[PDB]
Design a protein around this ligand. Structure first.
Ligand SMILES: N#Cc1ccccc1C[C@@H](N)C(=O)N[C@H](Cc1ccc(Cl)cc1Cl)C(=O)N[C@H](CC(=O)NCCCCN1CCCC1)Cc1ccc(F)cc1
Ligand SMILES: N#Cc1ccccc1C[C@@H](N)C(=O)N[C@H](Cc1ccc(Cl)cc1Cl)C(=O)N[C@H](CC(=O)NCCCCN1CCCC1)Cc1ccc(F)cc1
Lengths: 298, 298
């Protein structure tokens, strides 16, 4: 029993974190085989191609623990700098680089000076920011998921926006969202609530033994989405209904039946009650996160 | 900016998790140097001394990854079984065993069949349970804190109570709370809210840039505790006031000034507002957790 925000065990990523210094700029890098990946703004409205052509391999100081790694080559891929080093990381896990969709979750290993400090779960918001916890020196920290000892890296942290939320790239250096890597005040689009995740979390609550929010009503998909629009929820698609199939089958509660519960919760509030220890509707658990953590029997 | 429930990086503990099997009972163990620690109920109203004297070293099957470890000795310390193995764990971190006080927090590495599955933060509740997330097979999972690469183990998981909360021991096998390791329905005492942690979390909110809940009033310690009793909060001691000193100094808000805010929040609710993304008052962040994660400048 129970339900917590749960991160993946971080050890496979801890062994890859290094420190990258250029001039007086120091941030984190990711050491996989004989390449270190880090935000290209370590070399700093900039012209990065002009700035990088003025660089030499010996301008980059890469430190793994108390060992200095020698840079033997460098290149830029979109917004990530790639530093070839003379030593392959002996702790490289099996890994992939993946670009995720909004609404998906991942674990963040927050790092400072190449040293891991903590791990927590994030969701990619519909507006392509994350609501992280990051201080100065955290840039280059990565987000990841793990499946059968393969690490799928999906996020590298690049900047905190003026609103205090966070923006970054995939590990091939492409930003999520419309952002660019320059120190200008940039604004994200208006955010929305991840409806399919809220529904997954309601199923988690039922699996854990809580039913107070259920009702005898059902709704059509179209009528539910009219309420969704009113409360700044993302539209629920038939694909979302399909992905909730397994949780619906396990609990015996049809998806559109759970939508009628969510509709009632949106229109009336919780009236002083909690769900899985929360007084608001939680949207940073995917259906996959629920299946991963909750019992396979209700 | 930001504030998340943040676990310690788990890699140093991941390298210590093993599987212990006796008969048809399998749970997790902790492999440090040449000793494996696990809940003694793996050998199962039992008489453990009588049950253990009937055991042989070869009755214990210890598996680290896909490698079997040979047990060369066994003993019982309170409610933990200690299995001497023929191989010292080459990944043993620097470590200590510590017994924590209620109100303190720790990271839990949830494990199944000796394989880590996820990491999350817990607090030891005033009634000596934890509100964990655990399924069948999780017993033997451990809780820990990390300071400068030393792992302080403080919890080993032994059982889920009928209410769905969790009970366990320190790593020397002494239960937290009044519980015993037998499969009987046991009840915890009534729980209370960890007042000093709620205050720490309000300071976290101020550091992060949120002030809406402050007021111009102060309170005496005695008058605050009269309100605390009314709302099932733990009494605030002068020691608690002292430990909040650093956060009070950083924010410029006297502790008894923040108590007046908490009093107003308890008596009036939040009136539709949130604090650090929560619609209820959070009590599983210690003052230390706040200093660790939040900026050192407001
Ligand atoms: N992570 C992180 C991090 C955090 C702090 C310092 C440094 C870092 C890492 C650090 N690497 C980092 O991100 N630095 C960026 C500056 C930067 C550097 C390289 C690039 Cl390529 C792009 C950017 Cl942009 C940074 O300094 N952002 C600040 C951070 C800030 O003040 N938050 C206050 C919000 C308060 C929110 N308020 C609270 C209540 C209401 C709102 C907001 C900002 C201001 C002006 C701008 F022009 C652009 C951005
Ligand atoms: N972790 C864990 C875990 C979880 C499940 C299975 C197995 C394990 C690990 C597993 N190792 C474990 O703990 N097993 C214990 C049984 C046990 C074994 C060795 C010892 Cl020495 C002591 C105990 Cl006691 C266990 O089966 N507890 C159940 C678990 C249970 O049904 N929760 C339902 C609560 C629903 C809560 N409701 C929801 C809404 C309202 C309340 C509650 C219980 C029932 C009767 C008793 F006599 C004592 C305890």
């Amino acid at each position: 029993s129970g339900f917590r925000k749960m991160a993946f065990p971080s050890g496979k990523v801890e062994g890859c974190m290094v420190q990258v210094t250029c001039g007086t700029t120091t941030l984190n890098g990711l050491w996989l085989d004989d390449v270190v990946y880090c935000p290209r703004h370590v070399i700093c409205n900039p012209n990065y191609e002009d700035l990088l052509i003025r660089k030499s391999n010996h301008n980059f100081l890469v430190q793994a623990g108390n060992v200095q790694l020698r840079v033997i080559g460098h290149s830029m891929q979109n917004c990530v700098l790639k530093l070839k080093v003379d030593t392959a990381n002996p702790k490289t896990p099996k890994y992939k680089f993946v670009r995720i969709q909004p609404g998906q979750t991942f674990s963040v290993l927050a790092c400072y000076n190449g040293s891991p400090s903590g791990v927590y779960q994030c969701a990619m918001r519909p507006n392509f920011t994350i609501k992280g916890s990051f201080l100065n020196g955290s840039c280059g920290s990565v987000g990841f998921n793990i499946d059968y000892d393969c690490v799928s890296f999906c996020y590298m942290h690049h900047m905190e926006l003026p609103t205090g939320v966070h923006a970054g790239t995939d590990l091939e250096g492409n930003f999520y969202g419309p952002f660019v890597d320059r120190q200008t005040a940039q604004a994200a689009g208006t955010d929305t609530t991840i409806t399919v995740n809220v529904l997954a979390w309601l199923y988690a609550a039922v699996i854990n033994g809580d039913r107070w929010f259920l009702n005898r009503f059902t709704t059509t998909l179209n009528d539910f989405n009219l309420v969704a629009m009113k409360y700044n929820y993302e539209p629920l698609t038939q694909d979302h209904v399909d992905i909730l199939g397994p949780l619906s089958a396990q609990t015996g509660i049809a998806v559109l039946d759970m939508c009628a519960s969510l509709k009632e919760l949106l229109q009336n509030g919780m009236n002083g009650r909690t769900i899985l220890g929360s007084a608001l509707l939680e949207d940073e658990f995917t259906p996959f996160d629920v299946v991963r953590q909750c019992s396979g029997v209700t």
